[PDB]
């Protein structure tokens, strides 16, 4: 455990120290987990997260560098990133993010996301808060605390109600067979939010949220979404709203942008575009990798 120069960074299972290597004096992120406070010892969630990250080695996924056991502690050594997307979006809100940077970020997120789905891993809770960026113009998927890997959940929603602004509508409708498409939806809402500086589905809670989506994308039916009316939480008494002129929703978007967003936002999980598929979308025809100046 010594090759470090700790510094604070309210973390996850306790604190989260930013630190330096001793040999390499390199910035790293340390997640501290206690092994001697819980009835069953090492939390099953930590165990699942570790095995999950062990297989997720990709440039666009925060990398688990090492797992160190010391005393009554378990230290997860993650690669260190300076900040998250929420802070960034807020440090240029009026200024907006340049298209080349928005395109690059969405491009990387779809790469990390494609890698994830190729390993039977669903993130289930993608949002600005857990999409970290560094000073080399990279953005990475982080915090797989609500992930479903190999079909097994690291944690279920029932207790961890985060934010529902990026939750796919099939989850909201209690679909019992939801899968990888739910993450694509989250990215679709995040891709828009970047462009407009505003959250796509600014819903109040649980109930509103679903309607917030209906009042924007129109109440789905059996034509656009075969099987909706059979969803566990679908209600025949639902209000029949209609689509909104998307051209007015995400205005600064070019014919390709909405072309990609419209496919990441299909009500039908079967029609919704995949990560792999979106990678070959023309909107990514001219993708560079600009590197922003970070407000640190």
């Amino acid at each position: 455990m010594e090759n470090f120069q700790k510094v604070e960074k309210e973390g996850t299972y306790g604190v989260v120290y930013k630190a330096r290597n001793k040999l390499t004096g390199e910035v790293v992120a340390l997640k501290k987990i206690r092994l001697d406070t819980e009835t069953e010892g090492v939390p099953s969630t930590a165990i699942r997260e570790i095995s999950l990250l062990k297989e997720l080695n990709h440039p666009n996924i925060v990398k688990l560098l090492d797992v160190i056991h010391t005393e009554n502690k378990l230290y997860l050594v993650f690669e260190f990133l300076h900040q998250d997307l929420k802070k960034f979006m807020d440090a240029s809100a009026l200024t907006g993010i340049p298209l080349p940077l928005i395109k690059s970020y969405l491009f990387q997120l779809l790469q990390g996301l494609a890698f994830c789905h190729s390993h039977r891993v669903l993130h289930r809770d993608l949002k600005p808060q857990n999409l970290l960026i560094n000073t080399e113009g990279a953005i990475k998927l982080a915090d797989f605390g609500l992930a479903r890997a190999f079909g097994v959940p690291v944690r279920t929603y029932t207790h961890e109600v985060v934010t529902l602004w990026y939750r796919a509508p099939e989850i909201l409708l209690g679909c019992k067979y939801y899968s990888t498409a739910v993450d694509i939806w989250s990215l679709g809402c995040i891709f828009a939010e970047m462009v407009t500086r505003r959250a796509l589905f600014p819903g109040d809670s649980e109930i509103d949220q679903l309607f917030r989506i209906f009042r924007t994308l129109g109440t789905p039916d059996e034509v656009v979404w075969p099987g909706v009316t059979s969803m566990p939480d679908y209600k025949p008494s639902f209000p029949k709203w209609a689509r909104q002129d998307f051209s007015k929703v995400v205005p600064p978007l070019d014919e390709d942008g909405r072309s990609l967003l419209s496919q990441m936002l299909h009500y039908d999980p079967n029609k919704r575009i995949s990560a792999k598929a979106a990678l070959a979308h023309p909107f990514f025809q001219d993708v560079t990798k600009p590197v922003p100046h970070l407000r640190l």
């Binding site: 092994l35 069953e40 010892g41 190729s118 039977r120 669903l122 079909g151 990888t180």
Partner: protein, 247 residues
């Protein structure tokens, strides 16, 4: 595991990566100490049939026992265990497997109790840390049960087949795990063997692709067939009450 959740976007190569991962885990678990001696031992029979009944009684996820067995083996082959702590190790392997695959958590206090004697949760938990240190805190494995589905994918089988097939293979695999002469065999070989026993001359995609599959995995027709006989031996000699009769 509700089947093979989140697997639609997989392409042959991904399934191969997974197989390669169980190959490596098999190796890491095999470059042990006195490998054959552990698998032929009588104490391994008691330990696996015990964990097995415990899993059936507590009505555990069907992937808990399989992993618990893969983990018990690496622990026995990667460290020196005193006979007094055998039963305890079997409980830890069980406890750790639950933390990975179980829906209903598997409690240490309950396991200590099932162990009886001077065994306590506090002792099992101290043993779990030492065990996880051995496993470098990476506790999940790619089991033969898990492989069954990566193989059906590679053979572009229809969705509807998986279920019936998984359910026929599961029981054979569990028996194979309790037999040292069949449990020391590579994971895919056990998987393919059980799949042969259930799919051979019954499904056309099986019969059309099994040769290439075996070839790409370096498995000869001879190896597959021998394994099939090891598994059938494992099935015939399986006794749920072994740990009772002998222990």
């Amino acid at each position: 595991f509700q089947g093979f959740l989140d697997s639609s976007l997989l392409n042959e190569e991904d399934c191969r990566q997974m197989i390669y991962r169980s190959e490596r885990e098999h190796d890491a678990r095999m470059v042990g100490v006195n490998v054959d001696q552990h698998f032929t031992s009588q104490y391994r029979k008691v330990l696996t049939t015990w964990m097995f009944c415990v899993c059936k009684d507590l009505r555990q996820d069907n992937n808990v026992f399989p992993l618990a067995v893969a983990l018990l083996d690496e622990l026995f082959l990667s460290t020196r265990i005193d006979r007094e702590n055998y039963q305890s190790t079997a409980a830890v392997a069980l406890h750790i497997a639950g933390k990975v695959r179980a829906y209903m958590p598997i409690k240490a206090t309950q396991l200590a109790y099932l162990c009886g004697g001077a065994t306590t949760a506090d002792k099992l938990l101290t043993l779990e840390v030492k065990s996880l240190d051995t496993l470098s805190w990476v506790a999940d494995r790619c089991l033969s049960t898990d492989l069954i589905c990566y193989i059906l994918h590679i053979m572009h089988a229809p969705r509807e087949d998986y279920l019936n097939i998984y359910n026929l293979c599961r029981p054979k695999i569990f028996c194979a795990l309790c037999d040292g002469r069949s449990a020391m065999k590579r994971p895919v070989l056990i998987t393919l063997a059980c799949m042969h026993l259930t799919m051979n001359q019954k499904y056309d995609y099986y019969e059309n692709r099994i040769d290439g599959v075996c070839k790409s995995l370096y498995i000869t027709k001879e190896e597959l067939h021998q394994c099939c006989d090891l598994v059938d031996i494992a099935i015939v000699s399986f006794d749920e009450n072994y740990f009772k009769i002998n222990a």
